[PDB]
Amino acid sequence: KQDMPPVGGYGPIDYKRNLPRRGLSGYSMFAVGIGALLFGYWSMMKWNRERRRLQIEDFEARIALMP
């Protein structure tokens, strides 16, 4: 008399197949790429030109002496 089949309690689990967790698509990408890229170029011309100012300063001490 002690056999298995239970009265209730069932799901089931799915046979489904989906995980569309997107994801900033469709022209939202290529937008964070370009602006941060020119931001790095914007970081230039305030350092290389600044080091160029120090570069003439470095060559200044050479020319002032040597007579």
Binding site: D3, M4, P5, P6, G9, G11
Partner: protein
């Protein structure tokens, strides 16, 4: 791999000769384990293919879940894999108390 899909092709190849239909509780178990060995080939048929190819991690990510299934084989018949379980006279013996809130827990 197959432990209940083999011997399914043998008792059903013998019971036709002997003019026997198997009893109805027994037929619900041959479909249950006969539709559980396909969840052993179709795991091994992808991972071992994905090892020749050379991927490491889907070999270990699925056999660690496969261990939750050999506990069934040991609980019902006799051993780890190779079970003389299906007979020509239907099922050998009844599966014990349990294995119905386990499979539903597993699946």
């Amino acid at each position: 791999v197959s432990m209940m899909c083999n011997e399914q092709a043998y008792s059903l190849a013998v019971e036709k000769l002997l003019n026997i239909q198997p009893p109805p509780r027994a037929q619900w178990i041959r479909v249950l384990f006969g539709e559980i060995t396909r969840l052993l080939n179709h795991i091994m048929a992808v991972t071992t293919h994905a090892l020749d190819i050379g991927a490491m991690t889907p070999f270990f990510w699925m056999f660690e879940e496969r261990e939750k299934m050999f506990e069934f084989y040991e609980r019902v018949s006799g051993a780890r894999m190779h079970a003389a379980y299906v007979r020509p006279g239907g099922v050998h013996q009844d599966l014990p108390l349990g294995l119905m809130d386990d499979i539903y827990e597993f699946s």
